[PDB]
A and B are shown apart, each in its own frame.
With several copies, the nearest count.
Chain A
């Protein structure tokens, strides 16, 4: 069933059915026969974690158990640039966070990670039934990764996201048009975006 979805050549008219299987896991048992079988067949896993659903990421995607083997080659060129160390930061956050709940005297490096990491998870947080345009995902990831939001208090991150987008819509709507149009971030665009973000740090 699954192998009947593929990207075909241009001498096949460049067709492409994309497939998304959905598998319920009985108590999260991935060693169950049907879950094991499917995992092999597919080219990615998008594990969803219940605890993280409750923790407030809604939808919640446990990024540890999620993989996309094919990976970037369908990720927007711009979005690849910005989210390059987003994976590293999160991975570091995961290790640090485990230590953090034992709440001992923190290594300065670890509490840098901890503070940054906390903001990143909150930054990721999704709102059900409300997609977001990629042109307006590029700013948010730029801001976060370039640590402009690391300082900004955890509670009002949710406020910040909405407002930042509004601010760019008001002021830097030319920039947004460029991100949409050109889909890779030029030096000038990165700087422009940096200046805009920096300005919005204090609002």
Chain B
């Protein structure tokens, strides 16, 4: 990657998989080297080794390299030091959740648990920021309301709350979009949706411009154009 970045001068898009294996491997040869292991057996040199890898990868003026580093969070506990050490070094975290996968949503990315510090308002522009703030609030409200709907009942919810829930269920399944490499893991061809188109489409939903569209016609489809088309399909 350095050769590409530097000497071929070009931009890159590095991918590493899985960096927990990088931690584990290092832990093993620390113990083989006789070094006294630190917390949860992880190498005493864990920090500097992680640091060396991470620091080496960066956007210079010679080039730009965009790492995507997979991390495996053992037993889904990221309070375990090895994920936590990596957590510092990485710019744009993404959390994939078993639950969301189980709900049948592929991407399995849990939106409220994913955090990217590139969601700064200026960087993505004010409109994008505001729309995304509204989405985040809407979903967070829906999650809060899940408890009320489940036990206390769906009917005791306010008209305002009910509209927020109905939109949230639509948004939740509007997230669901197929993946081209999961024509193998599903069969539905994936959809590459433009950045502008996504911003636009989520805005529309929040306004409820497509609240005349079935919930399942948001489910596992691409853009707004597809959502409208799938409304017709379900109608038929």
| Chain A 76-102 interface residues, beta-carbon cutoff 8 Å to B | 87-88, 91, 95, 99, 101-102
On chain B, the residues within 8 Å of A104 by CB distance are 151-155
Q: Chain A contacts of B158 at CB under 8 A?
A: 103
Does A107 lie within 8 Å of B154, measured CB to CB? yes
Q: Which of A17-36 contact B (CB under 8 A)?
A: 26-27, 30-31, 33, 36
Nearest chain A residue, comparing its CB with the CB of B74: A36
Cβ of A126 < 8 Å from any Cβ of B? no
Question: If the complex has contacts A33-B41, A109-B214, A109-B216, are A99 and B137 also in contact, measured as CB distance less than 8 A?
Answer: no
- Which residues on the B side are within 8 Å of A13 (C-beta)? none
Contact A102 B151 (CB under 8 A): yes
Residues of B134-151 whose CB lies within 8 A of A: 136-137, 140, 144-145, 148-151
In the complex, B234 has a CB within 8 A of chain A: yes
**Count of residues in B whose CB is under 8 Å from the partner chain:** 35
Interface size class of A (residues with CB under 8 A): 20 to 34
CB distance from B136 to the nearest CB of A (A): 6
Q: Which A residues are in CB contact (< 8 Å) with B75?
A: 30-31, 36
Q: Does B106 contact A (CB under 8 A)?
A: no
Interface class of chain A by DSSP = helix
Q: Within 8 Å of chain A (Cβ to Cβ): is B103?
A: yes
Residues of the A chain whose Cβ atoms lie less than 8 Å from the Cβ of B214: 107, 109
At the interface, yes or no: A131 with Cβ under 8 Å from chain B? no
Say whether B151 contacts A109, CB under 8 Å: no
CB of A85 to closest CB in B, whole Å: 9
* Beta-carbon contact of A26 and B152 below 8 Å: no
Which residues from 46 to 62 on chain A have a C-beta closer than 8 Å to any C-beta of chain B? 51, 54-56
Picked from A30, A40, A54, A55, the residue with its CB within 8 Å of the CB of B21 is: A40
The 27 listed contacts between A and B (C-beta, < 8 Å) are A26-B79, A27-B79, A31-B75, A31-B77, A33-B41, A36-B74, A39-B74, A40-B20, A54-B140, A55-B137, A55-B140, A91-B103, A99-B150, A101-B144, A102-B148, A103-B158, A104-B153, A104-B155, A105-B153, A107-B149, A107-B154, A107-B214, A109-B154, A109-B216, A109-B234, A110-B150, A110-B216
- B residues near A51, Cβ cutoff 8 Å: 140, 144
* B230 CB → nearest A CB, Å: 12
Q: Are A54 and B150 in contact (CB under 8 A)?
A: no
> Is B137 within 8 A of A56, CB to CB?
yes
B164 to chain A, nearest CB (A): 12
Chain B residues within 8 Å of A56, by CB? 133, 137
Contacts A33-B41, A56-B133 supplied; 18 other A-B pairs, CB < 8 Å? A30-B75, A31-B74, A31-B77, A36-B74, A40-B24, A40-B72, A51-B140, A55-B137, A56-B137, A87-B102, A99-B150, A101-B144, A105-B153, A105-B155, A107-B153, A107-B214, A109-B216, A109-B234
